[PDB]
Symmetry: D2
Subunit: 249 residues, 4 copies
């Protein structure tokens, strides 16, 4: 029997690259998505034509609410229903937009930015562990958490909380043989709404090649951490940033 | 006129010591409380005996909810109402209890531990900044954030988010002349519920005198950070832990 | 042709496992040693039996001195003479013993602990870069911010090594040279240590209540030098079973 | 009886401001210097004019060598000889210049940069402890230690080692009642050699005021750490950087 993975926000960009690479390594995959239904089903279709019955999709909003615990439970339940086991969880889904200290209500901004980036990872980790060999969780963090973008306080709060979860969950789930680690991109795939001039500005900041990480490069680090080559690694966060975090103002 | 400070959770323990020390330094103070009305008024009475009309109380639940933004705005407004200005915000209020990965609903535990420790500070910070000299904010963090207590994941996530708020707000509010810093206790006043045996276990681990920090030692670092002696300091977190965070397992 | 790696302190324990795994991946290797000549040679012979003319040894003291820069240049040069290239440097060699604040002279303790852990790595890095998937991997310590009592000079050396990893990552990135670290917590315990003392350390590790094998540390080194790590520089990977997360 | 302090590299700039402020607070001071003999003697004279017999000078090269331990022992001995006690050590002296990886020999550069910034502090700390109230040591570190200047590898190594010393010594000397802490400037007094246009380049990076720290602002943080307001603080490093270390590339 092949092992099974849940990947959150897996329809496009980095989450798709992680899902694809896990599938190429021999995992069966749950492609979680929120709004990108067409891209999700398209991806599932490509993977299933490579190996029959190895990919399913699963829709869920990961905004904080009183029903979020049930949604996260159902995500993990979908992996067990499709494949009979759940070996790996990748917490990739993330809301990302500014929240100036000095449109959506603030309560909605808190719910989305802290829900997607921190509370849903926590609830999915709870559900994953309570349902349970090489078991692991990988959280997508941010290499620039201590050198944050101006006006992104709530996003930064969420990613710092995710670092805390990674460490707290590593410590508490170690007795159960569940490893918990992080992968911290610097600049990888730039925002679609970003103009080429702004993208180039960011690219020229990166010491190693003056270019962003490919989605495959991020996925490589995730694959290492779930592999038997990382069997003693837990509570670690691997920066995949081309040196960006090392560059002063 | 005298500057004014808001201290959250100021009725007892560390928040009380901070309020008293700010008052002794010449601040007028807003003593915020949730459940400890008797104790908040007792402190206010003691401070007003020393200087008439220099201490007022303010009630608010700081749990995350649809009304938390309004409650945070009214805490800040109460300082302006009473004293005509607000120079210092101290984010001290904090829920603290375990939340095992493997009684209150989990959605309530999220609301209290992430609301009090992180979301309320963010909303109080926004309100403080919007309503604006030596302006500063001090957040009460935790020196043991990277070596967390077993089964305290939501608490640890909240304190990590508070570190992120401290840094993000320091950056964004620097152009307004508002400094943002933290004080990180290790073991100070032990939980009232804790047994005397476990209390002594924790005391014995501390390199500097095998004892906990008094509330007044924590308050001393807060006084420094809001003073004219700290006018170039922002985004910094001062550990006050007697070396505890340096001690290996 | 095949790439080439220099591994310092490679005769035994962790450095030996790193050299073996690099060789198994297809690297030719320079096995550096200080005092362990018989172990270094027996490793070289074992590897050459697998593939002819793929392993050589190189003796050098890495203690700080006036001759240290020349010694470090000769180690790098030995890789070029043997194999015509040098793609990977692993800074593994390390002196480790207490230096309380309150029969070696203190100047000798300084020379050995700061030399091996920090100054030699810097000099080897300089020589490596000046001679040019190129990368350097430094062996750090996961417990650098929760140090053993009375190991001030050792801890200083290891912190300096973190600094070198970051500074060199930044400076050599334009030449395509990546610089990273692997940080063990408790791996192979000292040879003389009694099992009852070994057990006090093993019991502290959340993931399996055991120390890392040398092979597990080598696994992280192999990842960092591979094509799967080609955007990774200035990063330090903890391989510690969660030990650094455990409070007093 | 007045306590006594040793300040290394105290003839000029930040070390001088530290010596003056300690003196103003009531300390007798040893003014260590290397080349700046006229400035050291000028400072001792000003301080002695204010309170007789409260300042002496001590010349010493702090480059690494087989005689450095003797030199460090002598600096501490000079304090006991003049004042009969030594309560405070401030490790401020520092070489600072680039050492690119790709007319001083590299041997000399290692000696100077690692000697002054790290080995001399270690040996001074040893002598101080062995010759032994509010005893404490303050190391001058660097807020940019993780975002270093290009081509400053040896300097950066020295400062990283000083962080390690601060933490190791705090742990080991706690049982003797000796506290060990750090103060980490960002941009303070800029290099004398640096041109006006570069200086302006750095000033414009600082979020809080777009200016460098005064020497007196750095000294204020040292004063706090040696005071009775910091009796439970050990192994802590206070950044005094106006937010500089928070700014991304
Ligand atoms: N891209 C970078 O340069 C970079 C840099 C640093 C860190 N990271 C981290 O790496 C990860 C992947 O980055 P990325 O750029 O690929 O991410 P992204 O495109 O910005 O977002 C990934 C997915 O998150 C899902 N999502 C957003 N809001 C949601 C909600 N309320 N409920 C459920 N799902 C929601 C979306 O799914 P749908 O499309 O189906 O709606 C989206 O496709 C993230 O965790 C990110 O923070 C990325
Ligand atoms: N004590 C330590 O050893 C230690 C260690 C590390 C960090 N810290 C940090 O230092 C700060 C003070 O510590 P402490 O021990 O004095 O705190 P505490 O006694 O645990 O809590 C202080 C106050 O927080 C308020 N609070 C709790 N839940 C609230 C809610 N839902 N809404 C509004 N207010 C609420 C309470 O006010 P009412 O009583 O009025 O209800 C309480 O008295 C905290 O931020 C803590 O995390 C303390
Ligand atoms: N073992 C652990 O639990 C652990 C934990 C944290 C970090 N680390 C790090 O991981 C690396 C490997 O650890 P390890 O336990 O395998 O190391 P080790 O056995 O203590 O030493 C490795 C080798 O260092 C060489 N060495 C010592 N002094 C030298 C000198 N003056 N000049 C040149 N070489 C010298 C020795 O070579 P010869 O035998 O040829 O004399 C020795 O075999 C080290 O960097 C260490 O600090 C290990
Ligand atoms: N200035 C900044 O923006 C900044 C930023 C970050 C950190 N810092 C740190 O804060 C501290 C003070 O900074 P600063 O700019 O005032 O320092 P500095 O002027 O560059 O150096 C201070 C003194 O160090 C002494 N020194 C240099 N080489 C020596 C040697 N071989 N032996 C003995 N003493 C030697 C010199 O004494 P003599 O003149 O008597 O020869 C010099 O006056 C330093 O540790 C520095 O690294 C400063
Ligand atoms: N979710 C998300 N997070 C980020 N952090 C830095 N860039 C991003 C993008 S484009 N998306
Ligand atoms: N609010 C709060 N936070 C803490 N962190 C460590 N101990 C505590 C206590 S007793 N209260
Ligand atoms: N060289 C060396 N370094 C270490 N760090 C922790 N343990 C060790 C050992 S046994 N050797
Ligand atoms: N010693 C010394 N150290 C520094 N770090 C940043 N600037 C300096 C200067 S000007 N001198």
């Amino acid at each position: 029997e092949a092992p099974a993975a849940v990947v959150t926000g897996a329809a496009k960009r980095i989450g798709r690259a992680i899902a694809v690479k896990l599938h190429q390594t021999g995992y069966r995959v749950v492609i979680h998505y929120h709004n990108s239904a067409e891209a999700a089903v398209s991806l599932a279709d490509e993977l299933n034509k490579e190996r029959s019955n190895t990919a399913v999709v699963c829709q869920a909003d990961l905004t904080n609410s009183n029903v979020l615990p049930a949604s996260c439970e159902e995500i993990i339940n979908s992996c067990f229903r499709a494949f009979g086991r759940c070996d790996v969880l990748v917490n990739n889904a993330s809301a990302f937009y500014p929240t100036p200290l000095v449109g959506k209500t603030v309560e909605t901004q808190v719910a989305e930015l802290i829900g997607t980036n921190a509370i849903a990872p926590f609830l999915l980790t709870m559900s994953f562990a309570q349902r349970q060999s090489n078991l692991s969780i990988v959280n997508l963090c941010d290499a620039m958490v201590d050198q944050p973008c101006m006006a992104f306080s709530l996003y930064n709060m969420g990613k710092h909380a995710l670092v805390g979860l990674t460490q707290s969950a590593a410590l508490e789930l170690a007795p159960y043989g569940i490893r918990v680690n992080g992968v911290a991109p610097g600049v990888s795939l730039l925002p679609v709404a970003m103009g080429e001039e702004e993208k180039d500005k960011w690219r020229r900041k990166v010491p190693l090649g003056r270019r962003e990480a490919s989605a495959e490069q991020i996925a490589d680090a995730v694959i290492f951490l779930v592999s038997g080559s990382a069997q003693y690694i837990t509570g670690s966060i691997i920066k995949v940033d081309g040196g960006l975090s090392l560059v002063h103002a």
